[PDB]
Amino acid sequence: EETVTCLQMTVYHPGQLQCGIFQSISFNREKLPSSEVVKFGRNSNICHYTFQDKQVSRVQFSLQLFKKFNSSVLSFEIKNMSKKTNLIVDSRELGYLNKMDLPYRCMVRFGEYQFLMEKEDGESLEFFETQFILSPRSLL
Template identity: 80%
Template sequence: MVRKMFLAELIMSNFEDADTEETLTCLRMTVYHPGQNGGIFKSIKFYNREKLPSSQVVKVGRNSSICQYTFLDRQVSRVQFSLQVFKQFNSSILSFEIKNMSRRTSLMVDSQELGYLNKIDLPYRCMVRFGEYQFLLEKEDGESVDYFETQFILSPRPLLQENNWPTQNPIPEDGSYSSFSMQSASPTEMDENELWIQA
């Protein structure tokens, strides 16, 4: 009996002295691509939450040695875009900024067009697009400033139609966008060596 009481007191003492577990800010990314059944998202673990340190810059693209999240698609740049956590001045809440890391494809954040190395703070909910890729990004606030979470969700239907966002035509290979002159060929990325050989 005495031993049971001692064990109970020890457990209560450990429970009371344990650090309070903080909730984590989560960036939920719902994705859609018309060719998604072909395996382009094969390396993405959908519906799992992944815990990351706030100091980590998250990179999304084609190169698995650089990017945390990769798409198996030659039309995606080696690094397409990056996400970085920061705190607004006089705020305890984590925010995110997105930066376009692709030299050849503009990144649309709602109605804002980001060129190469342009960045913008993400609102709580927004649509991010490049080529035929559609991302609905939604932030869920947490208490921790040391860690955050990401979660990917696969949408069976186009996100633009469901959310009444305006459609965007694919961006041609030269990186310029015009609603009057569109190339029918999909953009493909070339190495600098390939360009040197052609020149």
């Protein structure tokens, strides 16, 4: 068998334990085909990860997978799918329909949401795993 790439995401929100923003979110490991486009946002019908929050567009941002030139493995690219809010990856600011490569480790945020992004590689080009972990406290 091969090792599949897993994206570990560790997430914080201040209203995490009072509001119900995270009540739909799965904390299982999720194994997905590399053709999949992972969607984050408000719309429960198409978003793999739904946030029950009015401060969130129906689709906030998305992850797609692709093979870089001169690479034997899968890379994540992140794309801002929201008009209103600017997605911030590390120090960089993504506007509507802007996209970027995803650092092996990075800080993704929009709103009061904090996404610690951590990539462990795999040999597999067919599938990828994604994993949601609730942070007890802020990652600042």
